[PDB]
Design a protein around this ligand. Structure first.
Ligand SMILES: *CC(=O)CNC(=O)OCc1ccccc1
Ligand SMILES: *CC(=O)CNC(=O)OCc1ccccc1
Lengths: 299, 299
């Protein structure tokens, strides 16, 4: 039916306000550690060409203003962890959930908790683009906002926000501090690669459209899989592996609609276009729903 | 930028599992009270033509299985409150936030917390339709899911889910138990009125599109306001009052684009269509963003 993010509860109790100088951004507070982007130590004009390890030297424990809502936290140690600033604190988080750090593979979706000063503002779901970018909302002071999944009752942190590219797309790192894609914490000529459509997702969403009583785009047409990929190369789509076909199986078996039949339906949708019509109240093709967050939705 | 629901944290700690017989649905737990739909006392075939007050008589305090996660709650009293079942409990909610009950006027948006057995599953934002319906996701056991706003740090409960209409649209009540629109907790021939577009919202979203660097739909054209409404009557749109014009003012003043100019832009968009183009990565016209959750987004 609708695009839905994960419950934000467990992550909300982890959001803190890390301020350094006139720089003030969000941070994640797990046990006696607080993570945030290492550019909090930078000033506006140091984002030109930054010497992070040397700037980090100027700083000492008293330079950081960690604020758990209203409780001000005593920072007892600072250390750089790639692009993230690791801060050992006095008082470990009592609200800390069971957590894991994951580096999600492109095409995978997660929920973002938008924060502006260490208190949550809103929550939405996006997807890791094949060119390693994200399409969210982040104005001033939103760096530090995290991205995550919740399986079972376990929080998998997989994103922190660092920068917006001069085209309106967003870039960041996992919780180890390592960037997704070829980007660096620096304001220089940094382009984004061409984006391709997450084919697998379009297919999964098509099944959800069928689940929901929208089946006009269907046909007794099938496709080889070798020919479909030619059509995909034509329309900036990701190609289809057998591994994509495999766990579309569960979805195929429910609706009794073969995967190759669904590709044939897609193939036609791209080639013919089928104007005026809407799939799940949308003319555009939706690639930000993984198979897993489709089975999960129903139910 | 993106559609974003409110943080679910404060509401999550309020979700409980109210089961009665083979009927099991969600409930809201505030202080020593637990709310849920009064159809939990009904059996499958009692939804045909239900005699609620008479069925409620068959029930006593021991008939209800309230489950705060894993802690089973002792229900000490039952009473009907219009379409909601009010349950006085042993143990009042320690996680209860500051809360208010509101009956939002149509066109207003809120966040839903989807629940399936008294634990939160996902969260998304929708809008109260002019015909008093909602477009969300609710499979079996999702009745009891609530809708809400968070201003300040104060939770305004404004929706609970009751039923899906045989067209895929959703109907429910405020937290007083009074339905939105002409619907009743009963499986009979209950149609939905024709839906109209929330004009005011389209306008606010257009400003956000301008905020975000998308300004192709603009012109030095203006419109009387008396003529625009004629165009609106033509396209199943809500008409424009002076009260709509008034608090589009703040948005108008920021972008320097007059409201009547924006209506002229809309007027053209509906009449001409302007094919192929996308506004904020969408061809469809978006009416589920109120002015308030646009100013709030930025920022
Ligand atoms: C998100 C913030 O409010 C703090 N950072 C910011 O506004 O952008 C600075 C920047 C980071 C990386 C590259 C270029 C500029
Ligand atoms: C949401 C539930 O899982 C419990 N109710 C339900 O499935 O629908 C029953 C019903 C309610 C109102 C009108 C008709 C049928």
């Amino acid at each position: 039916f609708r695009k839905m993010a994960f419950p934000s509860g467990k992550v909300e109790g982890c959001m803190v306000q890390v301020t350094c100088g006139t720089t003030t951004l969000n941070g994640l507070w797990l046990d006696d550690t607080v993570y945030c982007p290492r550019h909090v130590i930078c000033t506006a004009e140091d984002m030109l060409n930054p010497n992070y390890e040397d700037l980090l030297i100027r700083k000492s424990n008293h330079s950081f203003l960690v604020q758990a809502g209203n409780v001000q936290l005593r920072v007892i140690g600072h250390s750089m962890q790639n692009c993230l600033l690791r801060l050992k604190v006095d008082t470990s988080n009592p609200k800390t959930p069971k957590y894991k750090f994951v580096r999600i593979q492109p095409g995978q979706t997660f929920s973002v908790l938008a924060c502006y000063n260490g208190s949550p503002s809103g929550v939405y779901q996006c997807a890791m683009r094949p060119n390693h970018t994200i399409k969210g909302s982040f104005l001033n002071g939103s760096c530090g906002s995290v991205g995550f999944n919740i399986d079972y009752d376990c929080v998998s942190f997989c994103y922190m926000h660092h920068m917006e590219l001069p085209t309106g797309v967003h870039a960041g790192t996992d919780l180890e501090g390592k960037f997704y894609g070829p980007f660096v914490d620096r304001q220089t000529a940094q382009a984004a690669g061409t984006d391709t459509t997450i084919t697998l997702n379009v297919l999964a969403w098509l099944y959800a459209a069928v689940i929901n009583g929208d089946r006009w785009f269907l046909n007794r047409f099938t496709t080889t899989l070798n020919d479909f990929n030619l059509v995909a190369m034509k329309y900036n789509y990701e190609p289809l592996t057998q591994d994509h076909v495999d766990i579309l199986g569960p979805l195929s078996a429910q609706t009794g609609i073969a995967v190759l039949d669904m590709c044939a339906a897609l193939k036609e949708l791209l080639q013919n276009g089928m104007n005026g019509r809407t799939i799940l109240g949308s003319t555009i093709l939706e690639d930000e729903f993984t198979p897993f967050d489709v089975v999960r939705q129903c139910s």
